[PDB]
Amino acid sequence: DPAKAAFDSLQASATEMIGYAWAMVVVIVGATIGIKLFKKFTSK
Amino acid sequence: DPAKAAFDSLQASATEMIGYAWAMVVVIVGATIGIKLFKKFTSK
Amino acid sequence: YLSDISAQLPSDFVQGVQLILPSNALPCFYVILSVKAAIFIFDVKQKIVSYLDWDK
Amino acid sequence: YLSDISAQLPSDFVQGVQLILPSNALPCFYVILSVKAAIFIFDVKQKIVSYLDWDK
Amino acid sequence: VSGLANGNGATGDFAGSNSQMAQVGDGDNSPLMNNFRQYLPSLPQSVECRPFVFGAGKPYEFSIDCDKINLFRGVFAFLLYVATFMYVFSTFANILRNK
Amino acid sequence: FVFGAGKPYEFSIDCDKINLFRGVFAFLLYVATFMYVFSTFANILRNK
């Protein structure tokens, strides 16, 4: 099966990328929640 | 390599355009933050 | 308190503000700051006229 | 009341906050908490000077 | 009654309230409003700006740079000072207007 | 929560990334009560 080999490679690659993404989202969501708190403390 | 030459040209061009864009965004973001301050000072 | 929490607008975000600002913008802001003062003098002076009821 | 409703920020949402925070951020917050205290002492002390009208 | 406000003290029948009026406080420091300060949420501090790297080692490696983040921290400082000056001010003016 | 029990298209919203939300959500509820208890003691003589 020359197709099985190929399909397996692409799944492996995809899994790696989702890992890097779950990192980036926690850095950005952190920042957003941090701007929203400070602004609140400042303005009634 | 008749392809290397071409790929290099297109990257050069892209870099130039990103420069012009970083300019335009600072003019527009300036304006937006300036409308939002003045409106606030005016209405409780 | 207001001396060490001080910051100024960066110099790149000027070209923006000076493309959108009308002529009556800053003049208006100053009014909102003068109306405040006036009300504080009215309040203090209204409480000195109420001390005339302490001698009865 | 404030002892059992207590929670702390998870440790993953730090790298974020420490990329966006200016220098005058936390210093400002403390001011908003000191202005409060001051007004509470003014209020209590202003009500002790009004007891001077109970002897008339 | 003048000494329980000046902070000079009271001697007589008003000699019990000289310990109740020490808990109130004087100036910015109030023993009553400093009880609330052992229970303050712990917020992180401020450090210099470090980049974030997506995809260490792989062909698809990029980095959110600090040069365009340092500009945001500049505008963000300003918009926090403006919003405190307009709070300190407006609370002095309405000191007799029972908020 | 499992979408599509038994079929080729079976997936599950996992708990590992939901437990992190409950962590941030707790914090943002304590901060919003401390800033209420506090501010109601300070303005006890200011007739709200």
Residue numbers in the entry:
A (entry chain eee), B (entry chain iii): 5 to 48
C (entry chain EEE), D (entry chain AAA): 57 to 112
E (entry chain FFF): 306 to 404
F (entry chain GGG): 357 to 404
What did the published study say regarding this structure?
Most extensively studied in this group are the F-specific filamentous phages (Ffs) that include viruses f1, fd and M13. Ffs are also strikingly simple—their single-stranded DNA genome encodes just 11 proteins, of which 5 form the phage capsid. pVIII is the major capsid protein that forms the filamentous body of the phage. The tips of the filament are formed of the minor capsid proteins which occur in pairs. pIII and pVI form the leading end of the infecting phage, which interacts with the host receptors to initiate entry, whereas pVII and pIX form the trailing end11,12.
The pointy tip is comprised of proteins pIII and pVI, present in 5 copies each. pIII is the largest and most structurally complex capsid protein. In our map, the N1-N2 domains and the glycine linkers are not visible, but density is seen for residues 257–404 of the C domain (accounting for the entire C domain minus the final two residues). The pIII C domain is comprised of several α-helices of differing lengths. Two β-strands form a hairpin loop which extends over the exterior of the main filamentous part of the virion; reminiscent of sepals protecting a flower bud (box 1 within Fig. 3a). We observed two cysteine residues (354 and 371) at the start and finish of the β-hairpin loop, in close enough proximity to form an intrachain disulphide bond. A disulphide bond in this position would pin the β-hairpin loop together and further reinforce the structural motif. pIII is predicted to contain three additional disulphide bonds; two in the N1 domain (between residues 7 and 36, and 46 and 53) and one in the N2 domain (between residues 188 and 201). The C-terminus of pIII is buried in the centre of the tip, where the 5 symmetry copies come together to form a distinct stricture in the virion lumen (box 2 within Fig. 3a). Density was observed for the entire pVI protein, which is composed of 3 α-helices arranged in a U shape. Five copies of each of the proteins are intertwined and arranged symmetrically to form the pointy tip. pIII makes 12 hydrogen bonds and 1 salt bridge with its two neighbouring pVI molecules. The outer surface of pVI (which is pIII-facing) is hydrophobic with two distinct rings of positive charge. pIII forms a negatively charged scaffold around it, with hydrophobic interactions being shielded at the centre of the assembled phage. Fatty acids were modelled into the map according to their size, suggesting one molecule of octanoic acid (C8) at the tip, followed by one molecule of butanoic acid (C4) and then 5 symmetry-related molecules of dodecanoic acid (C12) in the third site. Accessibility of lipids to detergent could explain the change in phage stability; in this case explaining why sarkosyl (with the larger head group compared to SDS) only affects the stability of the mutants with the largest truncations.
